[PDB]
């Protein structure tokens, strides 16, 4: 096959969540990574994009991100569909949205617009009002829905997806919250990444948002769950995408993609079509407390409505050669979450045991918002213990780990910290395998029970672009913090 990695992932998803195929996950063909003619890699919307400079003077990544948001929105003829994590977009993120809506309205277009945020159980009516004011005359052309939502207080579940879909044709998604203080007006900007694509896979994002809004609209009268606000006398629009855009978006290229999300907890309890029978592993050091119900490691029905967890574990399991992971964290704070995803660590262990190389770059523990560990040993100890189950013991585990692991914290320049003295915060949710297939989205690899979304793309060209523009510069600067680095014989773990 031309797509051995997506083929494997797809086969897993059809066993895990068959009743969600089309809505919460979907394989499509005919997509394009949406880069410029001058710089074809600039579909990769990294931020800040200031490699080598501890002052972050020339933020070529931020500039391109904000420009691309406005470009895509400004090309709208029918719909604009946005999700993110609260707070609502502010600063130049909000400026970019407003500029795009005005651009589209001046071209004579009448738009439907949804903006959904997940929140701890902010104020939609105020954001609607702020936006309507800033739109000016353009607001005459726009039907707006704005909502904040919480799906489960006790499982800590709410939207965490960060999506911008225009006309079902273009989509930007990734880890980037639209938070000016963390990303923009700061001399220690968070490092993160979105991608830009067009094609049928953008339609997949639209159908995922219809799923979230269908729940949101159904619960709009429940005060503990949803705060909703619309323009004019407009109603809640649960199926804006299905109602307004083609069931299949137009093809724009030849890139194959799996779109995959999750429903968290409190939307749907199980996929009743699923006959998934997982082999669930055991461990004594993930569930820190006996009271905790562990959805990540011990709830079959949870997996069936959260295909993304399985998709990420299958993407790791597909690797023949090498895996690069860039995350805020691999481990979560317990309670209320378990410390780690056993199956994911077991998948990484299986790969190292077979000589497949694994690089994990996480955020510096000095950030502990943007870190949940005290030391890289909380990751290496765990990988070692899981390797021990399949290599015959602790010594042979340590050897397999030291021979096949790169483990480090993130820097973007020679300096251990930004020049203002703040540690580098990293927030990517990135996995790449074999210079071939990669995930960019909102789903963290640490235990998390939220609504999330992302794309798995099988395109060696784009993955090599990803290498050049992001992973290579990352490892250039980050390798100096490594506790384990097989490429240099370092093994301080
Ligand atoms: P993400 O990867 O930073 O954008 O968020 C995951 C993170 C924070 O979620 C929140 O909602 C923080 C409150 C606004 O992890 C959690 O889910 C912890 C929840 C407090």
Q: Is 459's C-beta closer than 6 angstroms to any atom of ligand 1?
A: no
Considering the domain architecture, whether residues 241 and 264 belong to the same structural domain is answered as no
Marked catalytic residue, from 427, 428, 434, 485? 427
Considering the domain architecture, whether residues 443 and 353 belong to the same structural domain is answered as yes
Chain breaks in the chain (C to N over 2.5 A) after: 121, 368
Structural domain ending residue among the three candidates 253, 274, 297? 253
DSSP letters of 80-132?
EEEEEESSPP-HHHHHHHHHHHHHHHHTT--EEEEEEEE-----HHHHHHHHH
Helix ranges (DSSP H) in 221-376? 240-244, 300-304, 307-317, 342-353
Distance 90 CA to ligand 1 centre (A): 18
Q: Whose CA is nearest to atom 5 of ligand 1?
A: 160
Closest CA to 171 of 34, 4, 15, 370: 34
**Residues for the chain: how many in total?**
493
For tokens 């993407």, the residue is 315
Considering the domain architecture, whether residues 34 and 101 belong to the same structural domain is answered as no
Rounded to whole angstroms, the Cα distance separating 484 from 406 reads: 5
Q: Maximum CA pair distance of the chain?
A: 71
Closest CA to 408 of 426, 435, 420, 396: 426
Known catalytic residue at 5: no
Atom of ligand 1 nearest to the CA of 118: 11
Question: Contact 141/105 with Cβ under 8 angstroms?
Answer: yes
Considering the domain architecture, whether residues 239 and 298 belong to the same structural domain is answered as no
Reported resolution, Å? 1.7
Rounded to whole angstroms, the Cα distance separating 6 from 317 reads: 11
Considering the domain architecture, whether residues 374 and 445 belong to the same structural domain is answered as yes
Structural domain ending residue among the three candidates 236, 253, 270? 253
Rounded to whole angstroms, the Cα distance separating 493 from 485 reads: 10
For tokens 């499509």, the residue is 28
Question: Contact 274/328 with Cβ under 8 angstroms?
Answer: no
Rounded to whole angstroms, the Cα distance separating 41 from 34 reads: 9
409: three-class secondary structure by DSSP: strand
Distance 334 CA to ligand 1 centre (A): 14
Rounded to whole angstroms, the Cα distance separating 423 from 366 reads: 6
Considering the domain architecture, whether residues 270 and 409 belong to the same structural domain is answered as yes
384: three-class secondary structure by DSSP: helix
Structural domain ending residue among the three candidates 237, 253, 269? 253
Q: Given its phi and psi angles, is residue 174 left (phi above 0), alpha (psi -120 to 50 degrees) or beta?
A: left
Closest CA to 328 of 162, 172, 193: 193
Token pair listed for 11: 């086969």
Q: Is 83's C-beta closer than 6 angstroms to any atom of ligand 1?
A: no
Known catalytic residue at 167: no
Distance 160 CA to ligand 1 centre (A): 7
Q: Is 334's C-beta closer than 6 angstroms to any atom of ligand 1?
A: no
Closest CA to 433 of 307, 363, 347: 347
Domain containing 97: what range?
A: 43-253
Considering the domain architecture, whether residues 289 and 170 belong to the same structural domain is answered as no
Closest CA to 232 of 145, 167, 148: 145
- Indicate the number of domains in the chain: 2
Q: Is 177's C-beta closer than 6 angstroms to any atom of ligand 1?
A: yes
Considering the domain architecture, whether residues 75 and 203 belong to the same structural domain is answered as yes
Q: Given its phi and psi angles, is residue 26 left (phi above 0), alpha (psi -120 to 50 degrees) or beta?
A: beta
Helix ranges (DSSP H) in 258-306? 300-304
Assign residue 302 the CATH number of its domain.
3.30.870.10
Rounded to whole angstroms, the Cα distance separating 16 from 25 reads: 11
Q: Is 372's C-beta closer than 6 angstroms to any atom of ligand 1?
A: no
Rounded to whole angstroms, the Cα distance separating 219 from 121 reads: 14
Cα R_g (the chain), whole angstroms: 22
Considering the domain architecture, whether residues 241 and 384 belong to the same structural domain is answered as no
Q: Is 160's C-beta closer than 6 angstroms to any atom of ligand 1?
A: yes
Dihedral Cα 16, 461, 183, 204, nearest 10 deg = -40
Known catalytic residue at 427: yes
For tokens 């009002």, the residue is 129
Which residues, including other chains, have CB under 8 Å from residue 244's CB and lie 6 or more apart?
78, 79, 112, 168
Considering the domain architecture, whether residues 188 and 271 belong to the same structural domain is answered as no
The secondary element (H helix, E strand) that includes residue 227 is: strand 226-230
Question: Contact 452/161 with Cβ under 8 angstroms?
Answer: yes
Known catalytic residue at 192: yes
Substitution candidate for ligand 1 out of 85, 162, 264, 368 with most atoms within 8 A of CB:
85
Q: Whose CA is nearest to atom 17 of ligand 1?
A: 448
Rounded to whole angstroms, the Cα distance separating 284 from 96 reads: 48
Considering the domain architecture, whether residues 420 and 359 belong to the same structural domain is answered as yes
Considering the domain architecture, whether residues 218 and 259 belong to the same structural domain is answered as no
Closest CA to 456 of 251, 319, 343: 319
Burial group, residue 4, by CB count within 10 angstroms (0-12, 13-18, 19+)? middle
């Amino acid at each position: 096959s031309a797509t051995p990695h997506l083929d494997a992932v797809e086969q897993t998803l059809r066993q895990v969540s068959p009743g969600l195929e089309g809505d919460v996950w979907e394989r499509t063909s005919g997509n394009k990574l949406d880069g410029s003619a001058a710089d074809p890699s600039d579909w990769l919307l990294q931020t800040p994009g200031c490699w080598g400079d501890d002052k972050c003077a020339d933020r070529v990544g931020t500039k391109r991100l904000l420009a691309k948001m406005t470009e895509n929105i400004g090309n709208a003829t029918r719909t604009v569909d946005i999700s993110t994590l609260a707070p609502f977009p502010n600063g130049a993120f909000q400026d970019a949205i407003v500029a795009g809506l005005k651009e589209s309205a001046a071209k004579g277009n009448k738009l439907k617009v949804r903006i959904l945020v997940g929140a701890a159980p902010v104020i939609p009516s105020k954001y609607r009002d702020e936006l309507t004011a800033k739109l000016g005359k353009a607001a005459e052309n726009i039907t707006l829905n704005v909502a904040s939502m919480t799906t489960s207080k006790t499982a800590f579940s709410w939207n965490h997806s960060k999506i911008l879909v225009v006309d079902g044709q273009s989509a930007l998604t990734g880890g980037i919250n639209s938070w000016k203080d963390d990303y923009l007006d700061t001399t220690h900007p968070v490092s993160d990444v979105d991608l830009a694509l067009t094609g049928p896979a953008a339609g997949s994002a639209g159908r995922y948002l219809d799923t979230l809004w269908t729940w949101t609209c159904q619960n709009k009268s429940n005060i503990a769950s949803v705060w909703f606000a619309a323009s004019g006398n407009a109603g809640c629009m649960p199926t804006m995408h299905k109602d307004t855009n083609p069931k299949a978006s137009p093809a724009t290229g030849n890139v194959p993609v799996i779109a995959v999300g999750g429903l968290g907890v409190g939307i749907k309890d199980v996929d009743p079509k699923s006959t998934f029978r997982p082999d669930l592993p055991t461990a004594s050091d993930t569930k820190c407390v006996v009271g905790l119900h562990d959805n990540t490691n011990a709830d079959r029905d949870y997996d069936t409505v959260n295909p993304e967890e399985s998709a990420l574990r299958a993407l790791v399991a597909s690797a023949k050669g090498h895996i690069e992971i860039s995350q805020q964290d691999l481990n979560a704070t317990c309670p209320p979450l378990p410390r780690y995803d056993i199956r994911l660590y077991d998948a990484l262990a299986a790969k190292m045991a077979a000589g497949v190389k694994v690089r994990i770059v996480v955020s510096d523990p000095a950030n502990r918002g943007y870190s949940q560990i005290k030391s890289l040993s909380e990751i290496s100890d765990t990988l070692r213990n899981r390797l021990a189950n399949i290599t015959g013991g602790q010594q042979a585990a340590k050897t397999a780990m030291c021979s096949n692991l790169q483990l480090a914290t993130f820097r973007s320049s020679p300096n251990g910290k930004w020049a203002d003295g703040h540690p580098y915060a990293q927030h990517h949710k990135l996995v790449s395998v074999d210079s071939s297939t990669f995930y960019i989205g909102s789903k963290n690899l640490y235990p998390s029970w939220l609504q999330d979304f992302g794309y798995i793309v099988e395109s060696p060209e784009a993955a090599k672009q990803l290498d050049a523009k992001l992973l290579d510069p990352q490892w250039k600067y980050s390798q100096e913090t490594a506790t384990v680095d097989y490429a240099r014989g370092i093994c301080n773990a």
